[PDB]
Amino acid sequence: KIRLYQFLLDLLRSGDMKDSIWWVDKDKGTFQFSSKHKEALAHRWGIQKGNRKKMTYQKMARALRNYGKTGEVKKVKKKLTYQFSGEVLGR
DNA sequence: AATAAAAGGAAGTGGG
DNA sequence: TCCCACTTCCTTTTA
Numbered sequence: 656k657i658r659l660y661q662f663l664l665d666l667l668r669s670g671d672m673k674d675s676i677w678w679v680d681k682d683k684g685t686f687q688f689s690s691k692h693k694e695a696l697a698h699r700w701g702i703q704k705g706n707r708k709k710m711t712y713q714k715m716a717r718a719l720r721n722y723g724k725t726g727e728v729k730k731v732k733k734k735l736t737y738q739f740s741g742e743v744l745g746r
Numbered sequence: 747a748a749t750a751a752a753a754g755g756a757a758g759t760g761g762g
Numbered sequence: 763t764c765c766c767a768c769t770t771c772c773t774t775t776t777a
């Protein structure tokens with residue numbers, strides 16, 4: 656099954672949910688969620704995974720935070736903003 | 747207060 | 763057995 660960081664990168668590449676997520680500086684890999692429209696993106700993640708419960712942005716961001724140590728995705732000191740690693744952006 | 751963003755410990759679920 | 767890669771639950775903290 657697809658990994659969360661890959662789901663997000665795929666969305667950013669396709670533009671399919673541009674009202675929920677967008678690049679801030681794509682060269683740096685920084686991206687930002689919509690305050691008002693992030694829940695619809697979280698719902699889509701849960702449905703893609705076939706999880707038992709409805710996915711929420713809160714639970715999706717809980718998963719995102721686990722990438723902090725390994726480095727695939729890091730939180731940026733800006734509202735609803737995160738940053739992919741160079742490895743993730745290259746691969 | 748109401749609302750939201752951010753955090754993280756801990757236990758549960760998948761598929762190896 | 764026991765890690766993967768989250769998911770789910772609950773509580774706290776800050777703005």
Ligand SMILES: N=C(N)c1ccc2nc(-c3ccc(-c4nc5ccc(C(=N)N)cc5[nH]4)[se]3)[nH]c2c1
Binds near residue numbers: 751753754774
């Ligand atoms: N509404 C808003 N416009 C808004 C905008 C930006 C915000 N940036 C925050 C936070 C930053 C740090 C926070 C925090 N540091 C913690 C340490 C420990 C724990 C714990 N559970 N031990 C919890 C913590 N939370 Se909250 N809140 C914002 C709100």
